[PDB]
Design a protein around this nucleic acid. Sequence first.
DNA 1: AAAAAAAGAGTTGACACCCGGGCGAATCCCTGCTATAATGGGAGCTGTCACGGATGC
Length: 49
Amino acid sequence: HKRRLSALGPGGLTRERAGFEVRDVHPTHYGRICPIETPEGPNIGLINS
DNA sequence: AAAAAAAGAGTTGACACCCGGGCGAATCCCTGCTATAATGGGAGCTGTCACGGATGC
């Protein structure tokens, strides 16, 4: 829970304003952001660690 | 074979009292008055579309 990287808050894209590109995984996350730990709820692809 | 009374009613004075209405007293709310010089304002998006409609020359 301490190694979490959220994308919301005061200055972040709202869940309704996320879209499809923000939730998608980018090929630069190799070794910097694990694309396997993410909540399977509505805010998918925004709480990656 | 007869014939009157503890209850059952019915009151009659005799307190005990319990909020109500005043008499106070103690204390709240309003309103105005202060005299050196005061002179234009701080967030907020901005990382969804798409449609469906309202103004303009």
